[PDB]
Design a protein around this ligand. Structure first.
Ligand code: CFH
Ligand code: CFH
Length: 6
């Protein structure tokens, strides 16, 4: 899994 960035 690759987490999102805000
Ligand atoms: O999981 C959240 C998302 F979806 F990427 F915005 C977080 F902001 F925490 F990264
Ligand atoms: O409101 C956004 C959230 F939801 F926190 F990701 C922002 F990144 F802009 F802060």
């Amino acid at each position: 899994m690759v987490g999102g960035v805000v």
